[PDB]
């Protein structure tokens, strides 16, 4: 083939960033495998905040296109809601588009409480893209849970991935800065996918939880309670130190999870971030596919090529 889980692509962190990507749809027509974006739900008022800093108003490339005719034409700065409508029109405009990951840090974790919890984040995706999402419950099938599922039967083809976005979460720098014990992104939103489960209601999920911090073993074995770690098929963690010796990474690779890794050109020896060479970039996206890596990211915007690269996962 390949699968989702048997190849490396690459990604651009902060693609709503509009020093990257002047439209976020120049980041969906840059080729990358996997765009991230940051979002608050903490925030005063209505809407989930697009801001890479403490967000006032938001601070992105996205414009809330109503349609592919609108691409590159509006004034910018809009919310999660407003990216997802770009997207909606740049996926109606490009049938069989390459499948695209959305990662997302929830910077400040989610607000529930203020009607951005776990299920109104599905609600809105559901209601912008809906059936161009590839989710848990379609992992999962029939099976119990999301890792039984991946482990014995894998991702589909690249190819039947054709016109799909998947999501996956992260928790954010700030809510790891807090004091209380507020449950965070990635405990809160497998729970989520549990308990919809539980309630035979995976169908409606949008997104896949990943342990976030590379780490030995079973990175989920940091979860008290066993019930959630099957949730979990999507791993990421910076990419030095899963190559620093301390870690198997071919246990992502044998099981099929997805394992992105973070910050690839600081892999000594160390490149440039944004503007290394084509060459270097290229031999680093393929030392990492080589350790395993689903997916390799940076901010290389300038290097279109490198950002389409799809590589066996591998070897
Ligand atoms: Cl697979």
């Known amino acids: ?3 989702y889980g048997t190849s490396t692509s690459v990604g651009v962190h902060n693609a709503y960033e509009k020093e990257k990507y002047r439209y976020f749809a120049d980041a969906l027509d840059s080729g990358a495998a996997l765009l991230e974006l940051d979002l608050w739900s903490n925030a ?5 905040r697009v801001s890479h800093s403490n967000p006032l108003g938001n601070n992105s490339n996205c414009e809330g296109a109503a349609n592919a005719s609108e691409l590159r034409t509006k004034s910018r700065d809009q919310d999660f809601a407003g990216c997802l409508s770009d997207m909606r029109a740049w996926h109606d405009a490009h049938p069989g588009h390459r499948p695209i990951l959305l990662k997302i840090e929830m910077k400040d974790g989610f607000n529930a409480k203020g009607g951005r919890g776990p299920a109104e984040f599905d609600a809105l995706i559901r209601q912008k893209l809906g059936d161009a999402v590839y989710g848990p419950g379609d992992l999962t099938g029939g099976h119990a849970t999301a890792d039984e599922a991946v482990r014995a039967g894998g991702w589909p083809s690249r190819a039947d991935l054709a016109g799909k976005f998947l999501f996956e979460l992260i928790p954010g720098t700030v809510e790891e800065k807090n004091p209380f014990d507020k449950l ?6 497998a729970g989520h996918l549990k308990d919809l489960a539980a309630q035979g209601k995976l169908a409606q999920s949008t997104a896949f939880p ?6 030995p073993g079973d990175p989920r074995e940091r979860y008290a309670d066993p019930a959630l770690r099957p949730w979990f098929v999507v791993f990421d963690g910076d990419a030095a130190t899963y190559l620093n010796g301390s870690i198997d990474t071919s246990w992502y690779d044998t099981r099929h999870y997805l394992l992105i890794m973070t910050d690839a050109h600081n892999v000594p020896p160390v490149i440039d971030g944004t503007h290394p060479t084509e060459a270097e970039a290229l031999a680093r996206v393929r030392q990492l596919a080589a350790a395993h890596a689903s997916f390799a990211t940076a901010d290389w915007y300038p290097l279109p090529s490198v950002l389409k690269t799809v590589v066996p996962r591998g070897a």
Not at 44 to 48: A, E, P, T
Not at 210 to 215: F, I, L, Q, S, Y
């Open 210 to 215: 990943a342990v976030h911090g590379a780490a």
């Open 184 to 189: 965070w992104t990635d405990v809160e939103y």
């Open 44 to 48: 005063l008022g209505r809407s989930w």
């Open 1 to 3: 083939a390949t699968t």
